[PDB]
């Protein structure tokens, strides 16, 4: 009684190969979760090791929704505040959006434009220790004990050694590491009404008691705000799925490789869930070091998500246009 769905696995495998070949990338990974149970429905890798499981990545933009959720959850911001989002400095260190300037944005805007400034200022309303604990409770630095070879814990540095610049760069996804599976896992906290799920490779007749991280209503509102990422105006319109509202993030993630000098490998990333309001599927795609022609992880995400929803009998919630 494995949780894996062949129809979805075949679809994940095929769109992944297609995308990796088209972009001439080194490698690729897809994870598909049942957004309500945490069942792994698919897990596809290009040939070689199980990167979904073994490869620590710095998540980039994909971590942002969590910072924003924490800030809404604690009442440190709300849906009406306009933040000053001008580039600014911490000590010598510039913080900037890439590479637009947005003078001000509300929280929806911060999500929509995936703003580094807005995110890092929402993070800065918490102490280093509170943020550390938050990242830890998302499972960052905590082994999943999947039972696969090469698995590791990840990296969350002790908060006592954090500089204010490091707290801020962690809020936009650098200086801490987790696997794609750990990242897809964190997303269940958003889809399953504030409750983080442990994930399982086996079919579930429960489904499991997870661990509350956010209020239900915080998760519900964050999902709505993530819809603006895939709509016109957002940074992830490449991951829009006809007929559905999709909540998602795109970004370039990083993979570190030792040793003489550490190699910063770039990884195209797209992660999301749909239907946004009542999610049924989380899809996460990474594509390692694309070379030709971020639509990179977006198109296969778009195809895998669309195809998974059809396979599972989930109907569109809005009109089709083309």
Curated annotation (Swiss-Prot):
Disulfide bonds: none annotated. Keywords: Antibiotic resistance, Carboxypeptidase, Cell cycle, Cell division, Cell inner membrane, Cell membrane, Cell shape, Cell wall biogenesis/degradation, Hydrolase, Membrane, Peptidoglycan synthesis, Protease, Septation, Transmembrane, Transmembrane helix. Coiled coil: none annotated. It comes from the Bacteria. GO terms for molecular function: penicillin binding; peptidoglycan glycosyltransferase activity; serine-type D-Ala-D-Ala carboxypeptidase activity. Its EC number is 3.4.16.4. One of its GO terms (biological process) is peptidoglycan biosynthetic process. Pathway: Cell wall biogenesis; peptidoglycan biosynthesis. The keyword Cell inner membrane applies. It catalyses: Preferential cleavage: (Ac)2-L-Lys-D-Ala-|-D-Ala. Also transpeptidation of peptidyl-alanyl moieties that are N-acyl substituents of D-alanine. GO terms for cellular component: plasma membrane. It is a single-pass membrane protein. Catalyzes cross-linking of the peptidoglycan cell wall at the division septum. Belongs to the transpeptidase family. FtsI subfamily. The enzyme has an N-terminal penicillin insensitive transglycosylase domain (formation of linear glycan strands) and a C-terminal penicillin-sensitive transpeptidase domain (cross-linking of the peptide subunits). This protein was sequenced in penicillin-sensitive strains LM306, and FA19, and in penicillin-resistant strains CDC84-060384, CDC84-060418 and CDC77-124615. The sequence shown is that of strain LM306. This is Probable peptidoglycan D,D-transpeptidase PenA. It comes from Neisseria gonorrhoeae. The lineage of its organism: Bacteria, Pseudomonadati, Pseudomonadota, Betaproteobacteria, Neisseriales.
């Amino acid at each position: 009684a494995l949780s894996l769905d062949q129809r979805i696995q075949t679809l994940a495998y095929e769109e992944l190969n297609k995308a990796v070949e088209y972009h001439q990338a080194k490698a690729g990974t897809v994870v598909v979760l049942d957004a309500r149970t945490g069942e792994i429905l698919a897990l596809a890798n290009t040939p070689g090791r199980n990167r979904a499981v073994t490869d620590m990545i710095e998540p980039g933009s994909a971590i942002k929704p969590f910072v924003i959720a924490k800030a809404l959850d604690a009442g440190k911001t709300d849906l009406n505040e306009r933040l000053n989002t001008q580039p600014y400095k911490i000590g010598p260190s510039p913080v900037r959006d890439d590479t637009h300037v947005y003078p001000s944005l509300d929280v929806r805007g911060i999500m929509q434009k995936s703003s580094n400034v807005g995110t890092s200022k929402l993070s800065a309303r918490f102490g280093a220790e509170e943020m550390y604990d938050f990242y830890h409770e998302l499972g960052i630095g905590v082994r999943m004990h999947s039972g696969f070879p090469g698995e590791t814990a990840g990296l969350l540095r002790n908060w006592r050694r954090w500089r204010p610049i490091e707290q801020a760069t962690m809020s936009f996804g650098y200086g801490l590491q987790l696997s794609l599976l750990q990242l897809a896992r964190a997303y269940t906290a958003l889809t399953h009404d504030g409750v983080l799920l442990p994930l399982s490779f086996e079919k579930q007749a429960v489904a499991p008691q997870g661990k509350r991280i956010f209020k239900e209503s915080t998760a519900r509102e964050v999902r709505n705000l993530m819809v603006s990422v895939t709509e016109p105006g957002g940074t992830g319109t490449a991951g829009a799925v006809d007929g559905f509202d999709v909540g998602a993030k795109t970004g370039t993630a990083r993979k570190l490789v030792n040793g003489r000098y550490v190699d910063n490998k770039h990884v195209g990333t797209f992660i999301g869930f749909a239907p946004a309001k009542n999610p049924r599927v989380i899809v996460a795609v990474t594509i390692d070091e694309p070379t030709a022609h971020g639509v990179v992880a977006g198109s296969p995400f778009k195809k895998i998500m669309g195809g998974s929803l059809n396979i599972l009998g989930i109907s569109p919630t809005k009109p089709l246009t083309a």
